[PDB]
């Protein structure tokens, strides 16, 4: 119907941070290790 | 008591209307717009090699 229904609202705020980005094909993907970051000494095993 | 139900969002797609001339197959075929096939009986093509 050429509808503007779903969403176009406010353009939120952007902030820089440390991360990693790889290019597997033209789909460009994050990388995240989640062991040394948050589950460091926490007694919950990593999933 | 208050108990309500929430339609938290609605999503749609669009029929991606492909155009046959906007397509890599288009040089295989002289696609001709001839609106007069209905009153036509038959065509022929001769070849002189």
Curated annotation (Swiss-Prot), chain B:
Q: Where in the cell is it found?
A: Virion; Host nucleus
This chain's function reads:
Self-assembles to form an icosahedral capsid with a T=16 symmetry, about 200 nm in diameter, and consisting of 150 hexons and 12 pentons (total of 162 capsomers). Hexons form the edges and faces of the capsid and are each composed of six MCP molecules. In contrast, one penton is found at each of the 12 vertices. Eleven of the pentons are MCP pentamers, while the last vertex is occupied by the portal complex.
Subunit structure as annotated in this protein's UniProt entry: Homomultimer. Makes the hexons and eleven out of twelve pentons. Interacts with triplex proteins 1/TRX1 and 2/TRX2; adjacent capsomers are linked together in groups of three by triplexes, heterotrimeric complexes composed of one molecule of TRX1 and two molecules of TRX2. Interacts with scaffold protein; this interaction allows efficient MCP transport to the host nucleus. Interacts with capsid vertex component 2/CVC2. Interacts with the small capsomere-interacting protein/SCP.
Family, per entry: Belongs to the herpesviridae major capsid protein family.
Protein name per the record = Major capsid protein
**Organism in which the protein naturally occurs:** Human herpesvirus 2 (strain HG52) (HHV-2)
Please specify the portion of the entire protein covered by the chain, as first and last position out of its full length. 51 to 99 of 1374
């Amino acid at each position: 119907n050429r509808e503007t229904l779903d969403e176009l609202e406010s353009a939120p705020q952007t902030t820089r941070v440390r991360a990693d980005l790889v290019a597997i094909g033209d789909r460009l993907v994050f990388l995240e290790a989640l062991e040394k970051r948050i589950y460091a000494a926490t007694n919950v095993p990593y999933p | 008591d208050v108990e309500f139900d929430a339609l938290l969002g609605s999503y749609c797609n669009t029929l991606s209307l492909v155009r046959f001339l906007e397509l890599g197959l288009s040089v295989a075929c002289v696609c001709t717009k001839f609106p007069e096939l209905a009153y036509m009986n038959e065509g022929r093509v001769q070849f002189e090699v």
